Amino acid sequence: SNAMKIGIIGVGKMASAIIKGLKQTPHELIISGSSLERSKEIAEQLALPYAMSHQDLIDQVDLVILGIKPQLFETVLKPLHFKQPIISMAAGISLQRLATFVGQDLPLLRIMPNMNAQILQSSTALTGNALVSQELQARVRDLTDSFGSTFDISEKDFDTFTALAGSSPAYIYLFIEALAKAGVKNGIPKAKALEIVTQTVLASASNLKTSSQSPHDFIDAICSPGGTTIAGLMELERLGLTATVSSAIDKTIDKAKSL
Amino acid sequence: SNAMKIGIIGVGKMASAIIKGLKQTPHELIISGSSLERSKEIAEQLALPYAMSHQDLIDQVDLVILGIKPQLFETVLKPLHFKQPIISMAAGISLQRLATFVGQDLPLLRIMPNMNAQILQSSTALTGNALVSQELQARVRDLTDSFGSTFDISEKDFDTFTALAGSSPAYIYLFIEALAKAGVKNGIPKAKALEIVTQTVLASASNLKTSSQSPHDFIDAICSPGGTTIAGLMELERLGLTATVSSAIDKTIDKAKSL
Amino acid sequence: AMKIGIIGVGKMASAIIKGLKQTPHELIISGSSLERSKEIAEQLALPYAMSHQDLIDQVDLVILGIKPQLFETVLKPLHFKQPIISMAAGISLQRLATFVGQDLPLLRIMPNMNAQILQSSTALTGNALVSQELQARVRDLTDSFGSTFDISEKDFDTFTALAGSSPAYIYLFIEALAKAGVKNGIPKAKALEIVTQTVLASASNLKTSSQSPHDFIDAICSPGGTTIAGLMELERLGLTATVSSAIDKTIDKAKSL
Amino acid sequence: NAMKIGIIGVGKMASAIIKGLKQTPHELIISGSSLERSKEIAEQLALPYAMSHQDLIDQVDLVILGIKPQLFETVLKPLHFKQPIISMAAGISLQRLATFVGQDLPLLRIMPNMNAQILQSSTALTGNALVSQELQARVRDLTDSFGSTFDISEKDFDTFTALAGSSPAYIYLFIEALAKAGVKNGIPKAKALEIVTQTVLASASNLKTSSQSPHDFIDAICSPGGTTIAGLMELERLGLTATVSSAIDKTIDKAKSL
Numbered sequence A, B: 001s002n003a004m005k006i007g008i009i010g011v012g013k014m015a016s017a018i019i020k021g022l023k024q025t026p027h028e029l030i031i032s033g034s035s036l037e038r039s040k041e042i043a044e045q046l047a048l049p050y051a052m053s054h055q056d057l058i059d060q061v062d063l064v065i066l067g068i069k070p071q072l073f074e075t076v077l078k079p080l081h082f083k084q085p086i087i088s089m090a091a092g093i094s095l096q097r098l099a100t101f102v103g104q105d106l107p108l109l110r111i112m113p114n115m116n117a118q119i120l121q122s123s124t125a126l127t128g129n130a131l132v133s134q135e136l137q138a139r140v141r142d143l144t145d146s147f148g149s150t151f152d153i154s155e156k157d158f159d160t161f162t163a164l165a166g167s168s169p170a171y172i173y174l175f176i177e178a179l180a181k182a183g184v185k186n187g188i189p190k191a192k193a194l195e196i197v198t199q200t201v202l203a204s205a206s207n208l209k210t211s212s213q214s215p216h217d218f219i220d221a222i223c224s225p226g227g228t229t230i231a232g233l234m235e236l237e238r239l240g241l242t243a244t245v246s247s248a249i250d251k252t253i254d255k256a257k258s259l
Numbered sequence C: 001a002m003k004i005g006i007i008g009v010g011k012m013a014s015a016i017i018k019g020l021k022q023t024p025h026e027l028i029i030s031g032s033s034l035e036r037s038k039e040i041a042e043q044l045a046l047p048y049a050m051s052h053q054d055l056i057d058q059v060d061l062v063i064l065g066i067k068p069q070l071f072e073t074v075l076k077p078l079h080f081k082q083p084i085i086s087m088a089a090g091i092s093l094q095r096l097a098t099f100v101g102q103d104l105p106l107l108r109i110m111p112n113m114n115a116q117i118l119q120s121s122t123a124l125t126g127n128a129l130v131s132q133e134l135q136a137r138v139r140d141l142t143d144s145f146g147s148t149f150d151i152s153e154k155d156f157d158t159f160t161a162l163a164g165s166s167p168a169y170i171y172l173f174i175e176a177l178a179k180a181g182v183k184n185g186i187p188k189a190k191a192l193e194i195v196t197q198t199v200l201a202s203a204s205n206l207k208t209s210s211q212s213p214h215d216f217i218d219a220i221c222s223p224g225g226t227t228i229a230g231l232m233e234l235e236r237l238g239l240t241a242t243v244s245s246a247i248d249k250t251i252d253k254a255k256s257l
Numbered sequence D: 001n002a003m004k005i006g007i008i009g010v011g012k013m014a015s016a017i018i019k020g021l022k023q024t025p026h027e028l029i030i031s032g033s034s035l036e037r038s039k040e041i042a043e044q045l046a047l048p049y050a051m052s053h054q055d056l057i058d059q060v061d062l063v064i065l066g067i068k069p070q071l072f073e074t075v076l077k078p079l080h081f082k083q084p085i086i087s088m089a090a091g092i093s094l095q096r097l098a099t100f101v102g103q104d105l106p107l108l109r110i111m112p113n114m115n116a117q118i119l120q121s122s123t124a125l126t127g128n129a130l131v132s133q134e135l136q137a138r139v140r141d142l143t144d145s146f147g148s149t150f151d152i153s154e155k156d157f158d159t160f161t162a163l164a165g166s167s168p169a170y171i172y173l174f175i176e177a178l179a180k181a182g183v184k185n186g187i188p189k190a191k192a193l194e195i196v197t198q199t200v201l202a203s204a205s206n207l208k209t210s211s212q213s214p215h216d217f218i219d220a221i222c223s224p225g226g227t228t229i230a231g232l233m234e235l236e237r238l239g240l241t242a243t244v245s246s247a248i249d250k251t252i253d254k255a256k257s258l
């Protein structure tokens, strides 16, 4: 059948998020944690089969997905013997470096998902090494489409995409929290302030998405002469909002590079 | 019939946006611009009846909507004789001040919409003076629901809501532009960078909306220990993203207060 | 064809006379002292008056070229009897009526130094005594040394910053580009030639195009390129905030004058 | 005395010089990042396309490169060049270009800007040791067709890139800042922008035709106890000059690292 068996090594927050989307596929799933005790425990919570070891996982599966953090790739992967294509979700680790940990004869793929996988709206980058066929990439693209959208991104752009899509949800939340806290400062209860700004963020992003106008086109439209919005906007300029965000993205990329 | 005749005095960007939603109602619409030449010209563009003067507008209508900027309220309104309930969309002008321009015997309402009215997803505050009945408020709430959602907000909170919902779209766009420009700095074409971040902003806001978790709960989930996201987040802290946004909201509110 | 008189002729007033010489009107000037009047009249190839009042009695229209802080001192002891045009920053039509009279049509202009090449961007406005006749005759005057903007008086201080003061900010900006050129190995004259020509062309491109400045910025910023690196440095150090705060200060000063 | 000129990579900048190239006697042909893209671009620009880069190279007297600097190595090494080549790329020296395309070719660099769209680019031009008097003169006619041309030595190219290639973006951010200051203070954006754009245009024209320096002009415009001097000292306070200089330095750093 089109159905394959997929094993996941390391199941934390990001891997847990993509499981939900993977349950909506025909495929069979099996997991493997940091200890056997931990594996049973999360297999409990997710209602899925667990493996007795990572090698035990590897020996029965058609495709492996790696959910461990990048700092543990060498330690965890080198002692193992892989036998199928592997997908890494890890920031900062190239396909070339993965091949040294895992083997030069394996088709290897990289994805860069985000926590919006939780609602099947991840914005996920996908790329493969020279051993990945058209058909295999398409099969994996089916997997990524199950928990959001999929972007065909060159590997040389993966670190930048990690910042724009992978990490940015946190920056978006801090920004949202900032508007809401400012509502609190100024008289509006937190829950109410959050509801208003979250709905406004949603609507503003849809409006941009479906319009041919740029972000600056909208800003010109919204800033009435001598109005309240231009006052707030020049305060954003004075305090360096744009420089702040961009510097943050630079730091994110720098970290991805050093990993 | 339930249908009324509604006249709009001053039709710029914000008033143009709410027309689309008002066309989806049973009601009859008529507009009135800055000059008769301008009125014909925009009635042309919107495919609607225009009035020969503001008084000409006032004499045939069941409800007036004011789309002029706050700085022109005194100049434009005092010479006129109003005969029906009026809705003001203007930032910074209380119902009490409007009554001095327009009359102490009129039911008066305030709304605070945003440019997302363009896609019928405005987040709109609504309030009325002591002359507004339950039935009239409900009829006007029907109007506001035609171009988005409606919030029952005390007038004392209108200036803060103006900042959180009315002006914030511009701040959201500048923030989005900042992420996208940072993608450009780092190798990703503008259009592509915008597509990725706009979709991520959309998805992140839906995820927050439908979840019981706070923005900081999500941030903890997204920040892997020693990872790329915590690096970028501490850079946002170092450069004062939260203080920046909040100071901007303060400036927005200050301007609303001085108007 | 009227006889037009100018009281006070410094930098701005001198720049404006080149354009006025190309109108059919007759001109006469009056300075800070008889000697100064003659010195100035010689170099402009124009007649001069023996005193401000002597100027006033023979002239259809007065143009004021003195600094705002001299308006009271210089105008109060005179007796005007024509429409007056003020080019002064900070001085309202209302305040001027206080110095010269409540029965006079009074206009304000706000030109800039580009009058020298007849390309000033000049705001024009008048009080309640100004017919659509008079505003027309005066608009012909201002079109002689550039373009004319019908600007309401409430917007004059801002126009003053945007068109009147801004040439100096533009020049500091150009100078900064050229100094940056010098710092990095290109001679001052050559860098200034390059930059001036680039500013000139850029603004011509913007003017004839339907695209916004930010649209052009998007076209110019190649992904991973040099321009986006420089642009984000400008954002880091606050170019936009800095210009805006300078404009606010210009407007604050206009207000307090 | 007419060449055929071929163009490899056609983005914003390359599309901008076409208009001037069309006013020349020379024949033109293009080649993009795929055959599908070549035809879309040919459609938009009303110009012949080649079936591939080598196909372009094989039938052409001169090659102009409009690809990004980051792509030179990947795109140029596999090909076999057979004629003089003009690069418009930031940051890549003639010496480095020769390692990608061969040591036996006359090679030239230009540095234009987006004002080529209206035939008013400020374009630097330089050639390697293999470029003749006559060839550079022929290239000078090419760049003269979309603006002015500056004979500048290559050691000065990264600085020229910043002053003339990148600077229009800095000029527009400045104009935009002036226009937004207008909006903040009650004047509509379109109106504000019309006023400042016209002022920048006239100011730069006055400077060009005067013998006075920018600082001379500043002295003229700053009436004692006036509004301009107050704004000027605010620019000084907040560091306008050092800000522009620092951006130029960063533009040049980037060109160096490319």
Ligand SMILES: NC(=O)c1ccc[n+]([C@@H]2O[C@H](COP(=O)([O-])OP(=O)(O)OC[C@H]3O[C@@H](n4cnc5c(N)ncnc54)[C@H](OP(=O)(O)O)[C@@H]3O)[C@@H](O)[C@H]2O)c1
Pocket: A009, A010, A011, A012, A013, A014, A015, A032, A033, A034, A035, A038, A067, A068, A069, A070, A072, A076, A089, A090, A091, A112, A113, A114, A115, A166, A167, B221, B222, B223, B224, B225, B227
């Ligand atoms: N979080 C995000 O929003 C995000 C977004 C995009 C990409 N990513 C990528 O996703 C990957 C995981 O990130 P995360 O945030 O999910 O990290 P996390 O929450 O810390 O999850 C890592 C998991 O791996 C487990 N683990 C530790 N040692 C192991 C080993 N010996 N063998 C098997 N499993 C082991 C840990 O188990 P215990 O709990 O028992 O210690 C933990 O649950 C990273 O590579 C990151 O680059 C994350």
Ligand SMILES: NC(=O)c1ccc[n+]([C@@H]2O[C@H](COP(=O)([O-])OP(=O)(O)OC[C@H]3O[C@@H](n4cnc5c(N)ncnc54)[C@H](OP(=O)(O)O)[C@@H]3O)[C@@H](O)[C@H]2O)c1
Pocket: A221, A222, A223, A224, A225, A227, B009, B010, B011, B012, B013, B014, B015, B032, B033, B034, B035, B038, B067, B068, B069, B070, B072, B076, B089, B090, B091, B112, B113, B114, B115, B166, B167
């Ligand atoms: N823009 C927003 O995102 C936003 C958001 C929330 C609330 N608001 C509120 O909405 C109101 C309008 O803002 P806006 O951004 O739409 O401003 P705008 O774009 O400048 O529109 C104002 C319009 O009123 C017209 N007008 C001027 N004088 C008039 C008079 N004599 N009689 C009738 N009409 C006249 C102008 O006509 P001409 O074009 O011919 O000059 C202009 O089209 C403001 O009160 C503001 O507080 C705006």
Ligand SMILES: NC(=O)c1ccc[n+]([C@@H]2O[C@H](COP(=O)([O-])OP(=O)(O)OC[C@H]3O[C@@H](n4cnc5c(N)ncnc54)[C@H](OP(=O)(O)O)[C@@H]3O)[C@@H](O)[C@H]2O)c1
Pocket: C007, C008, C009, C010, C011, C012, C013, C030, C031, C032, C033, C036, C065, C066, C067, C068, C070, C074, C087, C088, C089, C110, C111, C112, C113, C164, C165, D220, D221, D222, D223, D224, D226
């Ligand atoms: N400069 C600009 O770029 C600019 C731009 C737009 C608007 N403006 C406005 O234009 C006006 C002129 O400014 P400016 O920069 O041209 O100043 P300026 O060069 O210093 O001119 C002032 C002139 O007034 C003369 N004056 C002094 N006392 C006088 C008196 N008692 N009677 C008659 N004339 C007297 C001075 O004569 P002496 O030379 O003998 O001292 C001097 O020539 C100001 O009101 C300013 O706000 C200036």
Ligand SMILES: NC(=O)c1ccc[n+]([C@@H]2O[C@H](COP(=O)([O-])OP(=O)(O)OC[C@H]3O[C@@H](n4cnc5c(N)ncnc54)[C@H](OP(=O)(O)O)[C@@H]3O)[C@@H](O)[C@H]2O)c1
Pocket: C219, C220, C221, C222, C223, C225, D008, D009, D010, D011, D012, D013, D014, D031, D032, D033, D034, D037, D066, D067, D068, D069, D071, D075, D088, D089, D090, D111, D112, D113, D114, D165, D166
């Ligand atoms: N932008 C400026 O104002 C400016 C000013 C002076 C000099 N420059 C220089 O001009 C060059 C291009 O800049 P730009 O702003 O025009 O960048 P751009 O718009 O991104 O153009 C680069 C073009 O190269 C194409 N391309 C990608 N891969 C290719 C390949 N495999 N073979 C052939 N063509 C390929 C791209 O096609 P697709 O669209 O199909 O991907 C794109 O259209 C740069 O080297 C830069 O240093 C730029």
Ligand code: NA
Pocket: A091, A092, A093, A094, A256, A257, A258, A259
């Ligand atoms: Na790395």
Ligand code: NA
Pocket: B091, B092, B093, B094, B256, B257, B258, B259
């Ligand atoms: Na107020």
Ligand code: NA
Pocket: C089, C090, C091, C092, C254, C255, C256, C257
């Ligand atoms: Na004043």
Ligand code: NA
Pocket: D090, D091, D092, D093, D255, D256, D257, D258
């Ligand atoms: Na370089």
